[PDB]
Amino acid sequence: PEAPRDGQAYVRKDGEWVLLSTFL
Amino acid sequence: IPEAPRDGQAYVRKDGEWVLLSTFL
Amino acid sequence: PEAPRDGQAYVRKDGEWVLLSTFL
Numbered sequence: 001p002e003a004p005r006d007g008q009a010y011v012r013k014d015g016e017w018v019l020l021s022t023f024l
Numbered sequence: 025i026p027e028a029p030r031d032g033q034a035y036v037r038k039d040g041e042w043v044l045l046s047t048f049l
Numbered sequence: 050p051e052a053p054r055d056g057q058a059y060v061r062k063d064g065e066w067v068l069l070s071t072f073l
């Protein structure tokens with residue numbers, strides 16, 4: 001399914017969309 | 025959601041689009 | 050299709066899921 005549409009980037013983890021910024 | 029470009033570059037999902045990872049690194 | 054479900058983040062590249070950590 002689609003990631004949130006909220007001006008933030010997402011990566012795929014554990015069957016979820018997780019913010020990229022958390023890893024940066 | 026559709027495939028990302030297949031062009032040797034990594035993409036992340038943003039705003040219902042595929043965006044280059046490199047932009048954020 | 051789904052990325053691996055293994056506690057790790059993935060990005061999309063070349064029609065595949067590739068570890069985010071490789072790029073960081």
Ligand SMILES: CCNC(=O)c1cc(C(=O)NCC)cc(C(=O)NCC)c1
Nearest residue numbers: 021022023024047048049070071072073
């Ligand atoms: C210009 C913003 N770039 C990043 O924040 C960035 C880039 C990189 C990056 O370019 N890595 C290439 C080795 C890595 C990280 C990272 O490992 N953050 C952990 C807190 C962050």
